[PDB]
Design an enzyme around this catalytic site. Structure first.
Site, mmCIF file in Angstrom:
data_model
loop_
_atom_site.group_PDB
_atom_site.id
_atom_site.type_symbol
_atom_site.label_atom_id
_atom_site.label_comp_id
_atom_site.label_asym_id
_atom_site.label_seq_id
_atom_site.Cartn_x
_atom_site.Cartn_y
_atom_site.Cartn_z
ATOM 1 C CD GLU C 39 31.206 -38.344 86.679
ATOM 2 O OE1 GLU C 39 31.947 -39.062 87.381
ATOM 3 O OE2 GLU C 39 31.648 -37.445 85.935
ATOM 4 C CB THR C 44 36.570 -47.150 87.529
ATOM 5 O OG1 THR C 44 36.341 -45.853 86.970
ATOM 6 C CG2 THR C 44 38.005 -47.231 88.014
ATOM 7 N NE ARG C 108 32.033 -38.418 82.384
ATOM 8 C CZ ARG C 108 30.925 -39.119 82.577
ATOM 9 N NH1 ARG C 108 30.945 -40.289 83.193
ATOM 10 N NH2 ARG C 108 29.766 -38.632 82.142
ATOM 11 C CG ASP C 130 27.582 -50.971 83.567
ATOM 12 O OD1 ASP C 130 26.374 -50.980 83.855
ATOM 13 O OD2 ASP C 130 28.332 -50.000 83.755
ATOM 14 N N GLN C 134 21.231 -43.370 79.106
ATOM 15 C CA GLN C 134 21.635 -42.024 79.583
ATOM 16 C C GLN C 134 20.914 -41.831 80.909
HETATM 17 N N1 LIG Z 1 39.846 -40.017 93.601
HETATM 18 C C1 LIG Z 1 39.253 -41.079 93.050
HETATM 19 N N2 LIG Z 1 38.729 -40.979 91.839
HETATM 20 C C2 LIG Z 1 38.171 -42.139 91.429
HETATM 21 C C3 LIG Z 1 38.092 -43.331 92.093
HETATM 22 N N3 LIG Z 1 37.420 -44.269 91.324
HETATM 23 C C4 LIG Z 1 37.116 -43.632 90.225
HETATM 24 N N4 LIG Z 1 37.546 -42.334 90.231
HETATM 25 C C5 LIG Z 1 37.410 -41.321 89.200
HETATM 26 O O1 LIG Z 1 36.048 -41.015 89.027
HETATM 27 C C6 LIG Z 1 35.799 -40.910 87.615
HETATM 28 C C7 LIG Z 1 34.325 -41.037 87.381
HETATM 29 O O2 LIG Z 1 34.013 -42.422 87.446
HETATM 30 P P1 LIG Z 1 33.839 -43.117 86.036
HETATM 31 O O3 LIG Z 1 34.222 -44.542 86.124
HETATM 32 O O4 LIG Z 1 34.464 -42.275 84.990
HETATM 33 O O5 LIG Z 1 32.273 -43.056 85.888
HETATM 34 P P2 LIG Z 1 31.511 -44.318 85.327
HETATM 35 O O6 LIG Z 1 31.466 -45.335 86.380
HETATM 36 O O7 LIG Z 1 32.112 -44.639 84.024
HETATM 37 O O8 LIG Z 1 30.077 -43.700 85.100
HETATM 38 P P3 LIG Z 1 28.765 -44.549 85.039
HETATM 39 O O9 LIG Z 1 28.496 -44.798 83.598
HETATM 40 O O10 LIG Z 1 27.731 -43.706 85.691
HETATM 41 O O11 LIG Z 1 29.049 -45.784 85.785
HETATM 42 C C8 LIG Z 1 36.662 -42.049 87.094
HETATM 43 O O12 LIG Z 1 36.795 -41.970 85.687
HETATM 44 C C9 LIG Z 1 37.952 -41.734 87.838
HETATM 45 O O13 LIG Z 1 38.618 -40.629 87.281
HETATM 46 C C10 LIG Z 1 38.659 -43.432 93.382
HETATM 47 O O14 LIG Z 1 38.694 -44.413 94.130
HETATM 48 N N5 LIG Z 1 39.232 -42.231 93.788
#
Ligand SMILES: Nc1nc2c(ncn2[C@@H]2O[C@H](COP(=O)(O)OP(=O)(O)OP(=O)(O)O)[C@@H](O)[C@H]2O)c(=O)[nH]1
Ligand SMILES: CN[C@@H]1CCc2c(ccc(O)c2O)[C@H]1O
Lengths: 337, 282, 300, 54
Positions: C39, C44, C108, C130, C134
């Site tokens: 998370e 992203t 997500r 990447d 889990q």
């Molecule tokens: N407010 C805000 N939210 C962000 C930003 N970058 C990402 N997010 C949010 O944070 C959420 C969680 O990050 P994700 O990309 O979903 O998580 P992930 O990187 O896929 O998870 P991992 O598999 O652990 O890498 C994203 O889906 C966005 O909704 C940011 O700069 N600002």
């Protein structure tokens, strides 16, 4: 909850009572009068070039003439050790490959890696175009080993603390094995393909049954991870190579560890083990760029193979016991004799 | 006993220069991890140094000791031609190595595409052809002959050795051989030093509040080459521009000072830890 | 058979010719590995890089995420005012936006397998992938990645007042620091540079702006901290600028302790949603190779 | 709780098995090695005339 813990301790202590009551004498005292083998020295016969990066996998063929190797550039080359001529070169979809096999009939080759999918290729095909036959994809965690029972059955073990037996025709798991508490990294089928073992990261090994699908025994004589395992030609012993710079020999019938091979100056890990034709030598790779040769019944080192410029990651011996092939991380194979 | 004592000095220089390049020649070819795109230039330089130390110095030492030539006119001309050929083919490799370093550091991404084994072989063959063009062709064609009594007397004598040449050939040979690589090497190493200084500044900007090495290395590399070769290649033009200014003992001394650079080279180059490991093992 | 060898000799020639073509391509690519805690934003960043360079099931995926977010907030908080104390219970980040290009980025999805992206900038081959599990307490797959150009590390800098999922009593940011220390002091990764992305900068300004939940409570060392003299407060209130550099400084302490000149950490302040970070990877990747050659020839 | 019940049942299965002394196993291994030592090309070098790789 806690009530059953007292029962578990008594059962665990019961096991050691019977094992300690059967150790009549150590192996060394029995084989004290045996004359030593001597000094064993071998020289490189062939060197195989042509890979673009490090090598993890290697396996011979039943004819003991052709072999298959896998590497991280995405290639699966098939050699011909007699004349040093590549016969095939299969491109791969994923660049992360950690294992390969070679079917007993010679018409198939397997592969696997961090993509959690095992693939089967066809060699003896019409028009000479090698194409993917199946994609055994129902699994989780990276694979570590693949072995062929016959043209239709295959056994895989992965990092999700499980082992499974597949069916290529339908691409579904016939049975699954559970019980390890750590990642699984090796297995070796018995000569009759009825039993196999597996060494995990919880410093333990188990003896499964293919037909029944349940564990039978557990050997816990190590103190670190286990990276390799091989099976005695008799079918009633196996040697384990762990990450604490030691190799141990276990016996199925006596259900105890029999003998330990270690040296004081050695402080590096072990990546592969293998036996000889008659089960008298125990060749083992190492992380210090060379391979050592042990003695099965004396724990006396009897030679060093130090022709490599990087770590040794795989090792194999032909079916007729004529040559030893060792791959490394510098993209070079070698055939010793 | 001037000849007896100094004779060991010539032998010590000759023995070391021949034996120093054996380690570099054998290790690069025999081993596998030591073969790279940039080691071919080092091997070529070592080959040229071996040729010089085998064919130029011993004959000059024998001539100096015996005070007379013995083989005759044709072998004298051949010896002079080998001298010029091997001197020109050793300086011009250093410029290529400097340009290689400049390309590797200044433009990292395009370095892989720019230099390959075929290009290296082509450039080495071209530089060797240019080196051999200056020595054999204008010597065997008697294009350097001088017009005075001493020159014609030496050409007529079949048991003496000297070196009298024209002004025009002398200045052209000097320009082709030494002056052209010097400016290129100076510019290349100035640029490399500037890039290193900027890179050092960037780290201090990033890791602040947490250039001795480059200066020392560049200073050593340039100072050795300049101090060894420039003193000869100034008098080589001075003594033909005006007559009787420079005698012959100074000429020979400066020529041998230039000669010893080939012996000094394998200490400056091939100092990588892999080279040291190979030398210890072999 | 005399003619048997001739066919085999020709078979080698055709195959050995193809390997030369692949040699040039393989040696002219750069491989970049994405790491970080869960998370954080690993997916992203890889999403927008593919869209920026290279360039119907999402409808169901949004619905599944929207339903899960509503149920958790209404039920768990029962034990507008619920979102004020949203840190106590687990909650996704996309709850506010989805309930009320950019929309596709906010989605997500969990990670299984391996996910690779190919893109080229200025006729230079890049290959960024990447690796998702889990959770692995022990990474035995980290020895395979020993020849990569750089490691991209993504850390969420607006997640100091939250707790990890597997263990409900571990600070989230402090868990990110623990992971970095182990990765940096790894036997295999002895000559690999690290690029640090202090992500989620947008939320960090929001938390500090609101009075509640001061950072001094969770990190007592913040009380005695002061802005560095070599500070380039960008554009931003002095309070926000002090907060940003405290988190960055903690990561640099670990890296600067060891390395012996073979290791370097490049910190950046990003926001993976919108900030144009394509050039940031390119600029630092040319410095990694340039410094590597400078280390050779004893010039550094 | 349920998982611990399975573990106890599994361990009791291995508690009751037949075992033999170490001496018999060592004798069997030594006898096998002695019997098959003759046809071991790695131990006893083969003549160069009958070497496929030489
Ligand atoms: N407010 C805000 N939210 C962000 C930003 N970058 C990402 N997010 C949010 O944070 C959420 C969680 O990050 P994700 O990309 O979903 O998580 P992930 O990187 O896929 O998870 P991992 O598999 O652990 O890498 C994203 O889906 C966005 O909704 C940011 O700069 N600002
Ligand atoms: C007698 N030795 C010669 C004399 C002139 C000369 C040398 C080298 C390079 C040149 O360009 C020269 O003109 C010397 O090696």
């Amino acid at each position: 909850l806690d009530q059953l813990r007292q029962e578990a301790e008594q059962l665990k202590n019961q096991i050691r009572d019977a094992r300690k009551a059967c150790a009549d004498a150590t192996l060394s005292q029995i084989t004290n009068n045996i004359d030593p083998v001597g000094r064993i020295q071998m020289r490189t016969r062939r060197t195989l070039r042509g890979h673009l990066a490090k090598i993890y996998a290697m396996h011979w063929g039943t004819d003991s003439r052709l072999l298959v190797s896998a590497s991280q550039d995405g290639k699966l080359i098939i050699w011909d050790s007699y004349t040093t001529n590549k016969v095939h070169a299969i491109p791969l979809r994923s660049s992360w490959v950690m294992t390969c096999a070679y079917a007993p009939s010679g018409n198939y080759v397997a592969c696997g890696g961090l993509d959690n999918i095992c693939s089967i290729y066809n060699l003896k095909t019409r028009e000479g175009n090698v194409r993917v036959s199946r994609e055994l994809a129902g699994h989780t965690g990276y694979l570590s080993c693949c072995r062929f029972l016959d043209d239709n059955q295959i056994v895989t073990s992965s990092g999700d603390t499980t082992c499974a037996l597949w069916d290529i025709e339908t691409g579904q798991q016939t049975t699954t094995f559970t019980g390890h508490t750590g990642d699984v990294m090796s297995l070796s089928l018995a000569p009759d393909t009825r039993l196999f073992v597996s060494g995990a990261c919880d410093a333990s090994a188990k003896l499964w049954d293919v037909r029944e699908g349940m564990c039978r025994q557990t050997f816990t004589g190590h103190e670190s991870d286990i990276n390799a395992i091989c099976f005695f030609p008799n079918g009633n012993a196996f040697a384990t190579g762990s990450d604490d710079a030691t190799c141990r020999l276990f016996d199925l019938r006596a259900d105890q560890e029999l003998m330990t091979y270690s040296h004081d100056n050695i402080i590096c890990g072990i990546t592969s083990v293998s036996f000889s034709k008659s089960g008298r030598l125990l060749l083992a790779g190492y992380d210090d760029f060379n391979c050592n040769v042990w003695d099965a019944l004396k724990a006396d080192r009897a030679g060093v193979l130090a022709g490599h410029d990087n770590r040794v990651s795989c090792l194999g011996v032909t079916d007729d016991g004529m040559a030893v092939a060792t791959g490394s991380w510098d993209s070079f194979l070698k055939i010793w004799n | 006993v001037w000849v007896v004592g100094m004779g060991i000095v010539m032998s010590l220089i000759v023995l070391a220069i021949v034996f120093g390049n054996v380690l570099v020649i054998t290790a690069i070819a025999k081993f596998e991890r030591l073969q790279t795109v940039t080691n071919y230039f080092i091997t070529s330089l070592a080959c040229a140094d071996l040729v010089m130390g085998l064919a130029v110095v011993p004959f000059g030492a024998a001539h100096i000791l015996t005070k007379t030539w013995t083989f005759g006119n044709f072998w004298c001309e051949f010896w002079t031609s080998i001298d010029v050929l091997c001197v020109t083919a050793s300086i011009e490799t250093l410029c290529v190595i400097a340009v290689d370093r400049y390309f590797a550091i200044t433009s990292p991404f395009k370095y892989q595409s720019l230099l390959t084994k075929n290009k290296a072989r082509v450039i080495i063959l071209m530089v060797w052809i240019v080196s051999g063009l200056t020595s054999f062709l204008p010597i065997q064609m008697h294009w350097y002959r001088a017009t005075h009594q001493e020159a014609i007397n030496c050409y007529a004598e079949e048991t003496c050795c000297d070196f009298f040449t024209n002004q025009a050939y002398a200045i052209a040979s000097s320009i082709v051989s030494f002056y052209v690589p010097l400016v290129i090497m100076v510019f290349v190493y100035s640029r490399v030093f500037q890039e290193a200084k900027r890179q050092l500044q960037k780290i201090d900007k990033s890791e602040g509040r947490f250039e001795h090495k480059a200066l020392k290395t560049l200073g050593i590399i340039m100072g050795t080459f300049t101090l060894c070769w420039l003193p000869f290649f100034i008098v080589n033009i001075v003594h033909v521009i005006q007559d009787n200014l420079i005698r012959k003992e100074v000429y020979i001394l400066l020529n041998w000072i230039g000669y010893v650079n080939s012996g000094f080279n394998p200490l400056i180059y091939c100092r990588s830890p892999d080279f040291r490991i190979a030398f210890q093992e072999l | 058979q005399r003619n048997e060898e001739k066919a085999q000799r020709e078979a080698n020639k055709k195959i050995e010719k193809q390997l030369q073509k692949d040699k040039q391509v393989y040696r002219a690519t750069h491989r970049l590995l994405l790491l970080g805690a869960g998370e954080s934003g690993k997916s992203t960043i890889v999403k927008q890089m593919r869209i920026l360079h290279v360039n119907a099931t999402k409808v169901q995926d949004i619905k599944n995420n929207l339903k899960e977010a509503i149920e958790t907030i209404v039920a768990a908080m029962s034990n507008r005012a619920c979102y004020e104390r949203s840190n106590e219970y687990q909650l996704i980040d996309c709850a506010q936006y989805f309930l009320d290009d950019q929309d596709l980025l906010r989605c997500r999805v969990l990670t299984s397998g391996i996910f690779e992206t190919k893109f080229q900038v200025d006729k230079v081959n890049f290959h960024m992938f990447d690796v998702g599990g889990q959770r692995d307490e022990r990474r035995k797959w980290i020895q395979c990645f020993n020849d990569v150009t750089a490691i991209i590390f993504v850390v969420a800098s607006s997640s100091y007042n939250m707790v990890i999922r597997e263990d409900n009593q571990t600070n989230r940011l402090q868990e990110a620091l623990n992971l970095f220390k182990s990765i940096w002091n790894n036997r295999w990764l002895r000559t690999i540079s690290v690029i640090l992305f202090l992500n989620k900068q947008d939320l960090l300004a929001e938390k500090v702006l609101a009075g509640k939940s001061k950072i001094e409570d969770y990190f007592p060392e913040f009380a005695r901290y002061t802005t560095p003299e070599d500070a380039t407060p960008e554009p931003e209130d002095p309070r926000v600028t002090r907060a940003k550099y405290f988190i960055r400084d903690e990561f640099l302490r670990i890296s600067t302790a060891s390395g012996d000149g073979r290791h370097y950490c490049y910190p950046h302040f990003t926001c993976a949603v919108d900030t144009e970070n394509i050039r940031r990877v390119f600029n630092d990747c040319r410095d990694i190779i340039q410094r590597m050659h400078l280390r050779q020839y004893e010039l550094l | 709780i349920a998982q611990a019940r399975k573990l106890v049942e599994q361990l009791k299965m291995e508690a009751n098995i037949d075992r033999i002394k170490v001496s018999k196993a060592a004798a069997d291994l030594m006898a096998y090695c002695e019997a098959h030592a003759k046809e071991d090309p790695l131990l006893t070098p083969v003549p160069a005339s009958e070497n496929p790789f030489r």
